[PDB]
Amino acid sequence: LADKYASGNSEISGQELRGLRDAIGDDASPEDILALVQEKIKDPALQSTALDYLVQTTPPSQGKLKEALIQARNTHTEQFGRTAIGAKNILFASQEYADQLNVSPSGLRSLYLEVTGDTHTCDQLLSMLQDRYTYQDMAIVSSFLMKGMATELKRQGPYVPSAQLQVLMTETRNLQAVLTSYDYFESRVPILLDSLKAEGIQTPSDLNFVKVAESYHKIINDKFPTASKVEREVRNLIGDDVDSVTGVLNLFFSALRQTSSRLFSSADKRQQLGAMIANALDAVNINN
Ligand SMILES: [Cl-]
Ligand SMILES: [Cl-]
């Protein structure tokens, strides 16, 4: 039934599916069929969905038509590949998350196909997304990406690059942890900067939580960090006032404690970084 096939799909109605069915004659060619599907349905994922409905609900009396519909669907899949099938696989997730975000489901499916169409590291995902979404919305988008990928791994098929998706899920999980980290900086950085300003300590006026968080992540990802290289990172960020430098170092030490256990290679590595930061705090006081 068209209503059943359209149930819970916010982008196609039962009426639209029945209309398409009724417009397709018994002797329609595959080309005729695709022309009508294209006219009535704009998005390739939804076209593919409509084609599944048409094939599946053509009765035996219309054997010729069923064959033509199967050919039409095969041609559509030949045309689009993963662009149709991958998007179709995540249709309902895209609708759920589009509702959350108040955006188009199709735009989310395009983003999903962009993310899943290449290797991306966490850094690359952050860079793509931060120009397109607020940090708050990035967290929601990350949940969408995770849900979509898990759905495709459940579905399998030639247009699902399962091993690639597994790696992207690891990197997305990493992104989620980075976003949580950024929330700590978003809370604390304005407080620190306002506190310094209230005591007449000048800090660069373009310094914000993102820049501070970027410096912290650079330190935890450095293959050869040292106490001196942490202190220098901080001085490059906020300048040379002893209280400014101390405040950022304490903030980094606190951030370390709370960072996920996926953004370090081991608990030993996290401890080593903490000891470096503590050594930098001591150095800053000695040299004051
Ligand atoms: Cl058209
Ligand atoms: Cl196929």
Ligand SMILES: [Cl-]
């Ligand atoms: Cl949109």
Ligand SMILES: [Cl-]
């Ligand atoms: Cl997290």
